[PDB]
Design a protein around this ligand. Sequence first.
Ligand code: HEM
Ligand code: HEM
Ligand code: HEM
Ligand code: HEM
Ligand SMILES: N[C@@H](Cc1c[nH]c2ccccc12)C(=O)O
Ligand SMILES: N[C@@H](Cc1c[nH]c2ccccc12)C(=O)O
Ligand SMILES: N[C@@H](Cc1c[nH]c2ccccc12)C(=O)O
Ligand SMILES: N[C@@H](Cc1c[nH]c2ccccc12)C(=O)O
Ligand SMILES: N[C@@H](Cc1c[nH]c2ccccc12)C(=O)O
Ligand SMILES: N[C@@H](Cc1c[nH]c2ccccc12)C(=O)O
Ligand SMILES: N[C@@H](Cc1c[nH]c2ccccc12)C(=O)O
Ligand SMILES: N[C@@H](Cc1c[nH]c2ccccc12)C(=O)O
Lengths: 349, 323, 337, 334
Amino acid sequence: GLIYGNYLHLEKVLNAQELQSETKGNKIHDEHLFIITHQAYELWFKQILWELDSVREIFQNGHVRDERNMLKVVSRMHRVSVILKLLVQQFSILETMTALDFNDFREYLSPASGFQSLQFRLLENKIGVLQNMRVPYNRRHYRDNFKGEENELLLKSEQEKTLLELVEAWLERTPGLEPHGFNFWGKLEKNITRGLEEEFIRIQAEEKEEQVAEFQKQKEVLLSLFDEKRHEHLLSKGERRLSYRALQGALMIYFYREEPRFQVPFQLLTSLMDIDSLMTKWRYNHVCMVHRMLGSKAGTGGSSGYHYLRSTVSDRYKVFVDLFNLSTYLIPRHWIPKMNPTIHKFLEH
Amino acid sequence: GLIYGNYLHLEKVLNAQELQSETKGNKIHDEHLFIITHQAYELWFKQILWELDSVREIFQNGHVRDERNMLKVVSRMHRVSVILKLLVQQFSILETMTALDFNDFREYLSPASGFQSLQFRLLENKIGVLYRDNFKGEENELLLKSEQEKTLLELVEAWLERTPGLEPHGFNFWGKLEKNITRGLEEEFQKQKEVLLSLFDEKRHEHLLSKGERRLSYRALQGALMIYFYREEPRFQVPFQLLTSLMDIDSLMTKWRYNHVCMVHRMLGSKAGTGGSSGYHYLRSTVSDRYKVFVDLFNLSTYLIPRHWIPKMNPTIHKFLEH
Amino acid sequence: GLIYGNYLHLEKVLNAQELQSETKGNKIHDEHLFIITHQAYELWFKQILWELDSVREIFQNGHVRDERNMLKVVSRMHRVSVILKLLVQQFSILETMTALDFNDFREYLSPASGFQSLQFRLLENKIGVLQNMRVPYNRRHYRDNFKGEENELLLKSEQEKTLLELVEAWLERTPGLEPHGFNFWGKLEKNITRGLEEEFIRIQAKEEQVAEFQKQKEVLLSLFDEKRHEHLLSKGERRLSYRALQGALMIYFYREEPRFQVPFQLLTSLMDIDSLMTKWRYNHVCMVHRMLGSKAGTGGSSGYHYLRSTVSDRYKVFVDLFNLSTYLIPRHWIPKM
Amino acid sequence: GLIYGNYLHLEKVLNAQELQSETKGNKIHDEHLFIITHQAYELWFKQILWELDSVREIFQNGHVRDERNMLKVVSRMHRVSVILKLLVQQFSILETMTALDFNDFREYLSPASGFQSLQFRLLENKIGVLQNYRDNFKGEENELLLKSEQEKTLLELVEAWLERTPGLEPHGFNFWGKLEKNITRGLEEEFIRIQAKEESEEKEEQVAEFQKQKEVLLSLFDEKRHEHLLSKGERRLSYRALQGALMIYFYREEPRFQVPFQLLTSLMDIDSLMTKWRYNHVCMVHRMLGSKAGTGGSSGYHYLRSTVSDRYKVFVDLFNLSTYLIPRHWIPKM
Ligand code: HEM
Ligand code: HEM
Ligand code: HEM
Ligand code: HEM
Ligand SMILES: N[C@@H](Cc1c[nH]c2ccccc12)C(=O)O
Ligand SMILES: N[C@@H](Cc1c[nH]c2ccccc12)C(=O)O
Ligand SMILES: N[C@@H](Cc1c[nH]c2ccccc12)C(=O)O
Ligand SMILES: N[C@@H](Cc1c[nH]c2ccccc12)C(=O)O
Ligand SMILES: N[C@@H](Cc1c[nH]c2ccccc12)C(=O)O
Ligand SMILES: N[C@@H](Cc1c[nH]c2ccccc12)C(=O)O
Ligand SMILES: N[C@@H](Cc1c[nH]c2ccccc12)C(=O)O
Ligand SMILES: N[C@@H](Cc1c[nH]c2ccccc12)C(=O)O
């Protein structure tokens, strides 16, 4: 007969708390809070990876093509986002430890650090952090912190398809992009040209000289969206992550989100942004706690400490930057290519 | 030397997830979340036990008498509050599991249930909640001892009885208080008068104690009111924070029970639980003041009077209640 | 050009703070907190009403029929829940006021109370709380607080279609229920009857299980008892029509089918809102207990004891959505498509 | 008789919502959310100002000297951080507005913006955000803003109180003189240990780390270095207020120091939460605008990112004192 403790394997979970300060002569009371906190984070990291891998598989094995699977995909991605909120507020518990009491056992931690968290790196990689985009500390690649089987695992996570790459391929298949079909991009380029011209004609008919200047730059940006060569250049700089065609699909889903087939997909894209946003907030809440804990002391793990972490709060680690930056090309509602009754029907369940 | 995963014994923590649906033929994806969620709770239960026992020990070994320890005491108790708030919020994660998906692996859980959580019971007992069939062997022992050892309620109680100002040949708070309330009432209804004076009925209080309506002794109650009214006095400041934290822990506990109820409702409807209870209904009954260990601290708000009525503290007792 | 303060009408919002303790002689510092806190609850009440009326309108005027609008409906209802979530937590700001400090200005408040909040009642009604659902004290006093224009709005909020009623009509049109078509209810009764029979066979092949089985057979088959449904629909155990219940269950079982994906989100949101309204009632209670103890309320209720009575399923407008969990069956039994 | 709606002045509060999009024809449903959200923020800003001024007065009028008042001071300061935490969470509400729906009424907002929030500026100044923006303000509002720059800030008031911390006096406990003495000996003893070790790469690694540590620790006792950093703005507290804060950190368990230590912790909490407000703000603004310039004239997203830095952290020094934490046995005995 199943027993709660055995089902949950608490004989392992609740016998995993060894205070290094205890195993060295003077246990420091607050080291217990320190271990439990990290262990709770790591248990949730594992859950995130579980969801994340299942969603990667759904894309990879072709099942995302069958649109009855979108509810499951969006519901699991949103769950990753919900766990991450919890992880962001979880720092409030560690923050009840003063820096003085932390100071009483910090000496027993060296040279271990969060640099040695296998799962945090797995998670970064599987979402789609580019290894060359990573802020360096001590002049070498992050994987130097791992050896053997763990190193092997990390390498596979750098090599296997990332959430970013999977979502990208799917985005490239978004209905409506086909030039000989609805031809979204063609119609969009045309409609933006018209809009601008009607807008310029309206303007030229202090405010004027300014509105002209304001017009002139909005025009450059909007029209630059159709410069594919410019995009390719920004791709290789890692300034952009998505392929030109994938950007098109994403924009297609933004504009026509209310169309029934695009409603859950638009929720997914929103979730992808949520997850980028939560991950960075995790980083920043981390940074704020570490400032109070260390001041400007160097880290047990070999970094500058507070200062290094601060530099990781940046778009370098924002995998779906392209989804955020699409808001740059938002246009007036009536500029958006109208849908005929055939494609309106194409995009119905 | 030391490595992250070894340090945290991730070898154990991250190798502790066995889907009962998987070992039984058809693995259900959402059972992983079900397992991880309970494991995170238990970890935090263990942390709470760790803080709680450490605070009980400070009361027990006499260190609480040394008032330089109050900061340690309040801060650890506040920490318990903070952890509990996260635990209340943590239900929102499990709530991303639809009842339908839950329904796909629930069959593999019987007869197990939360009734078998050792740490939850240890928690309730050590705080002062006044089922053990669900345990036996060595676990029944710890459970036994947690009922027999002095509770947080009893330890706070004794400490509350030693509160300065409560001695009849000293500042005589209680005598002075009955005088000022007898005066102020007749200076000024019958219903408030009835209630306010019943505070001075020690006999009524003892009767309510045995009835279980009240937990703290009469004397301990007096110290608590003394700390409320004079909380700004330096020696009472951190003690007042402590009383506040005790009340915090009480609310968060039932808020835990209640968020639990709301989720279980959506998961089970009116089905009976795997542990043999009526389920939702049974859980609804635990969200009551029967489980509120520090009810008296809440109830004291009944007897709050105008500032004027409060026994003026002369310069003698003022300098005494200075650090 | 417009300016922030003017745009937001801050000349109204930030000039709305009058400390009654200050008006009557002695300013008590924490009354400001007290005031701002309610004002913020009411701004959000207004917002909730705004989302809510607009979703009601989408149902009422037929727009929901075009499923293009389902993203809007679910986004706004989920928005209502996100706001309620914030409002549950907002109590922690007022909890930084000790009971002893509150007691220094409580006297200047009587006989006014939260009981006189028009928007809270509007919200209750527009979601769908019926007069019968209300606690006896509340039923004969909630409307006896307002007059004229406010009383006008209250009557409307009850006379007009509720979210409950509107969602009920729409659930009744759930594709799949039509007997000439997919005949969901017919297939379901057949499959469950077959399932129970296979199950009873398995248990006979092997004392507790037969007893468990029997209770479960009793409950499941009872689902198909429409008369029982109406009887319960009169003791107030149930609120939704029979057919609407079938639509809800249809959306649960077939939630992955694309036309049901967003509808399923909506039912979940509906339950979220119910939960969060009660968690609001309960956080409220927990606070008030520490503020009043056993003292009666300024509005004349018993205080703690009364408020605690509102933390009841009798106030859950969508109880049925919760209670359909009672009737969940193994995947295998669900009628195939 | 007093009535709820009247008490709260809801005739003002619930009649303050004017959708500009509506005023110009096409009502956009989400503009209402946008308005209510900002209005809620401003009510909470007002509450913060209220609490914050009350605490400033306690200091300014000398009431902090009477230590009866420390419970009030800390509880109100803690109250401020509890409000700020809600304000940070409050962004999640506005985040249920998509960028495309925001786009439908954004044009009606120009040229208003958060630059024109009076209360947010007052908040910054009163806490003590160093000057080195009033363009967006005029008239009486401009006046108030000046007054907030000239009146004593929370930072300045806490600084003065820290300068009066008991224990600092040289002919009394002489905390600083003793602290320097013990640090110097502590390091010299640590250095003896390292020297004893056998010549290795590890030993040199320990010597090298030691030297870096010794230099940092002992620079605590360089007052000229501190003054130089003050002038550069890289620091904010006087040298002596720093000694007081350190005194309170080290001896926090001493009864007279318990609640003051809570106070200092609360200050760091508020810095931490202000910057978390700015960053949550940033994250939302990126989804809303991408790289479009703000209606208020800034570059937008890029500008807001720059406000998320220690340039705005009023109590940096309280954070940076963790740089000088030492082993317990080096702390001067009482
Ligand atoms: C007192 C509390 C903490 C301190 C002082 C601290 C400090 C640091 C420091 C200084 C680093 C940079 C590496 C180094 O030089 O050591 C770091 C990295 C890291 N820490 Fe923390 N940390 C704390 C709490 C936590 C917690 C609770 C977690 C939960 C898993 C965590 C996870 C990580 C991770 C994943 C990294 C790598 C981050 C990256 O490179 O982006 N830390 N930490
Ligand atoms: C889908 C989620 C859950 C369901 C359906 C559920 C259901 C139940 C039920 C029906 C009971 C009463 C005993 C029984 O008949 O089995 C119970 C008890 C209990 N469960 Fe949960 N539960 C859930 C999640 C959790 C979680 C995540 C925890 C975290 C540790 C937890 C901890 C407890 C505790 C401590 C009790 C005993 C409570 C008391 O007696 O006051 N449960 N649960
Ligand atoms: C110190 C804080 C509070 C106390 C002591 C308190 C107390 C009470 C009491 C006693 C009642 C019952 C009516 C009566 O007899 O007066 C009540 C009802 C109510 N209050 Fe509060 N309250 C507090 C804060 C709030 C806040 C912040 C709100 C936010 C809007 C609020 C809104 C309401 C509402 C809507 C009702 C009617 C509830 C129902 O009928 O279910 N109250 N309150
Ligand atoms: C869709 C939502 C929002 C957007 C797109 C947005 C955008 C911006 C931008 C672009 C600026 C820089 C000035 C400019 O060029 O306009 C700014 C500043 C500011 N905003 Fe927001 N904002 C939003 C919501 C809010 C909310 C809810 C508040 C609450 C009061 C707020 C308060 C402020 C404040 C106080 C500033 C000045 C901050 C500083 O200069 O450090 N904003 N905002
Ligand atoms: N489901 C189809 C079509 C598709 C691709 N990307 C999409 C985005 C939104 C909606 C549909 C699609 C496929 O995967 O090939
Ligand atoms: N790197 C941290 C120490 C630390 C944080 N989390 C850890 C987990 C395990 C081991 C060490 C750590 C510091 O410099 O203070
Ligand atoms: N510390 C002393 C005095 C004391 C008892 N109870 C208190 C409550 C508040 C302040 C001081 C006390 C003791 O433990 O006996
Ligand atoms: N008692 C729960 C099952 C359950 C909840 N949490 C558990 C933890 C372990 C084992 C079983 C459970 C039910 O009736 O559905
Ligand atoms: N949208 C159609 C059909 C419908 C009713 N209820 C539904 C639930 C889910 C999907 C479609 C429907 C209508 O309103 O009449
Ligand atoms: N009913 C509350 C008083 C109260 C709570 N919230 C209010 C808002 C406005 C006016 C009065 C109130 C009591 O009995 O103490
Ligand atoms: N309260 C006294 C002494 C004092 C100043 N700073 C302190 C810090 C901690 C404890 C006491 C003090 C004063 O204001 O002058
Ligand atoms: N600054 C925002 C507009 C904005 C945000 N909050 C505001 C409050 C009032 C007026 C305008 C705003 C933008 O550039 O899009």
